[PDB]
Point group: C3
Chain length 295, copies 3
């Protein structure tokens, strides 16, 4: 796209604020930003806020979201679809034109780990170019295992294809498949979907801890066979809904857009890989590391 | 196939009749019928009754099916495999020769949303050419959420490949991936697997209704990441068995041949897309629409 | 690999012995062995013990495994990752050099049907070349349906690609997808992953029996839509954990590395195919047979 030649819009922080006991404002941008998805490989991503996947959103069950999208793309319209919400797609997930803003309001009444993404036709194009992310909705009554958890992180799986190539997007294998982590608390890492950052700077934990991961596979196209090497998942909640409780899974099948809360114990010091067990995808990037130490 | 050149057998209605409290007769044809799977693209499908997917069958839990297949194909043998039934495959799902009939009898003792398909070697060939469908077996004690449901529809996902090309069938990506709807009650739509009909003539519903969909992904080859835009599934029963109950799923993973009953609320007027969230497949056709109005 | 030219190491039996109430020794080899994966097609597989998938391991919940790997490969290092165990991957699943042994110790505290495989970088390469298998961990309190089961078998699904071709492994479709069976009791078959053996020598059962299958899809890359023709699964335990109980599934979705215990009734004499319902994979080999007789 001629109007994207040379464009590299600096990342803008997510803006969020509570405005009532059950109402939150969120303000994001749609923007065009160069991301290093593999060593030496820059993708001029279509993004929310200059991150791909986008910034993490966390709300409470029962919160109504008042969402603003500021479209900084000079020529392409963009939109937002939160899977967490009940909305009219043809009124509430509609396009915001270049250089304009739009505000939409809708309730998040279901707990879980939900995908969000741009909803602009062709959706495949907007997702594959980078406009995806996760919104967590915290359950009003928690999870039955909350008292057991020592540490938590968010991981997101996505694919990258040949740049803005709709033939490849529809008909080709992924060039890269990657994990990213999004911060839940100060000091947590916050990364983009790339083949290396979570290998080089592993997530951290202590020996004997029970770890919770909030996970979502945003696709666009692949399913995920989520596995942590050297452990077994003690508890799994499908889509992060507390009622969808499985125990003792070695690997969690995630559809495209599929989420879960998973919990596991790291019993020994060492480095623990985190993979999709579809090993072709792992080989093309989708391995993160968790470094477990005595401190 | 030389004997299929020029053949376009008119669709024949499904014949069904109850013959006892726990016995039903079903009579289908195997026939060769031109179907428009994409605008301008005719596929000379191998079908049951000149529909692809085939006609919907609905029986009650505990019904014995007395099934007749009349084979109208001039040269290819065909057969029937109902996933709902307990049968001897090598006695009961056997071939009926061109211009002959065969009758087979077997019980449907398990509730759910089951695939049926031709079982003639090579099965991939017969399925991919169009000989697939769904049989619903209604649970004797219903579903715990039955009283909540306002409206219901059936949707089926399938793929189409290069015409009768076994190399493509085994080794290629789908050319199209599509939804169809099959009628449960008078006035419901009844369509074939195509890229456009359920976009142009959406399914209908009223604001505030809880909708049930009976869904099956017949493949032949792909898995499905079933999602309704603008809502969350309140209840999901895997394979339509009432015991396999999940809550608050954003997306349901269906294997090839996999079924579910899913229920969700449409809270606002508008058009709600229904997709497989494997967006490559969506882009190649698998988007249906549900139009929700104040009346 | 020049040092593998002409090498065909005879299969070595698995060595296992109990050494305490909650401790077992297991001794395996890594070795290079010619396997006939399709009629006329030899693959010079990287194996455990000259079988691909590897020998079946069965332990009890709560057993600590003292595992020895003797590496008979003249030039490639190998390792072992059991999904059943809690271990430090970077201390316990490490490489054993050619012509050396290594001993590692770790607990199996979770019941189920777990994948094991070589963990040597690039893992995709080691898995795809044949270094995969299953370890069953028997639950201390059994399965609620144990008293109903008449007969049991183990089946494993895997893929084969172009020989030792990492481009194909990462980016290509499988050449073959196959089932194998591993012996649980004397007299059971014990086979390798090939396109024909379980068609030509079906598994055996008697009319009216409830059959249990312990199943795992080791990949490396594909998911599995596991189905037995002519029946419905009465009970399914995901990953073989007794808590993950589904009922009346026609087809079980398995991730790559995914396992299950499944149970079904064969009501009539005949031959019952067992497939992945991803029919492209079935066509490329993944059909086994169960022959059900009056005796
Ligand atoms: Cu309040
Ligand atoms: Cu507001
Ligand atoms: Cu966009
Ligand atoms: Cu979506
Ligand atoms: Cu792919
Ligand atoms: Cu702890
Ligand atoms: Cu664990
Ligand atoms: Cu009766
Ligand atoms: Cu009759
Ligand atoms: Cu047929
Ligand atoms: Cu079938
Ligand atoms: Cu495909
Ligand atoms: Cu209502
Ligand atoms: Cu909803
Ligand atoms: Cu003891
Ligand atoms: Cu020992
Ligand atoms: Cu190895
Ligand atoms: Cu593994
Ligand atoms: Cu493939
Ligand atoms: Cu019995
Ligand atoms: Cu059955």
């Amino acid at each position: 796209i001629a109007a994207h030649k040379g464009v590299n819009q600096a990342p803008v922080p997510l803006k969020m604020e509570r405005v009532g006991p059950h109402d939150v404002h969120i303000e994001m941008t749609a923007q065009i930003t160069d991301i290093e998805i593999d060593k030496g490989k820059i993708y001029k991503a279509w993004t929310f806020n200059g991150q791909a996947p986008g910034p993490l959103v966390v709300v409470n069950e029962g919160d109504t979201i008042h969402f603003t999208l500021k479209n900084m793309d000079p020529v392409v319209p963009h939109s937002m679809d939160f899977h967490a919400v009940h909305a009219s797609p043809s009124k509430d997930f509609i396009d915001v034109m270049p250089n304009k803003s739009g505000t939409f309001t809708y309730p998040a009444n279901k707990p879980g780990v939900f995908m969000y993404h741009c909803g602009t036709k062709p959706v495949l194009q907007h997702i594959a170019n980078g406009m995806h992310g996760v919104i967590i909705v915290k359950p009003k009554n928690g999870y039955p295992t909350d008292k057991e958890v020592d540490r938590e992180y968010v991981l997101i799986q996505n694919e990258w294809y040949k740049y803005n190539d709709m033939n490849d997007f529809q008909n080709g294998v992924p060039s890269y498949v990657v994990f990213s982590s999004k911060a839940l608390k100060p000091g947590d890492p916050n990364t983009n979907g790339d083949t290396f950052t979570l290998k080089e700077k592993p997530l951290l934990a202590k020996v004997g801890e029970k770890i919770r991961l909030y996970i979502n596979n945003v696709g666009p196209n692949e399913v995920s066979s989520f596995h942590v090497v050297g452990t077994v998942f003690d508890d799994v909640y499908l889509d992060g809904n507390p009622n969808n409780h499985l125990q003792g899974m070695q690997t969690v099948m995630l559809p495209a857009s599929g989420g879960a809360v998973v919990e596991f114990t790291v019993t020994r010091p060492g480095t623990y890989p985190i993979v999709t067990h579809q090993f072709n995808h792992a080989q093309k990037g989708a391995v993160a590391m968790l470094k477990v130490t005595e401190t």
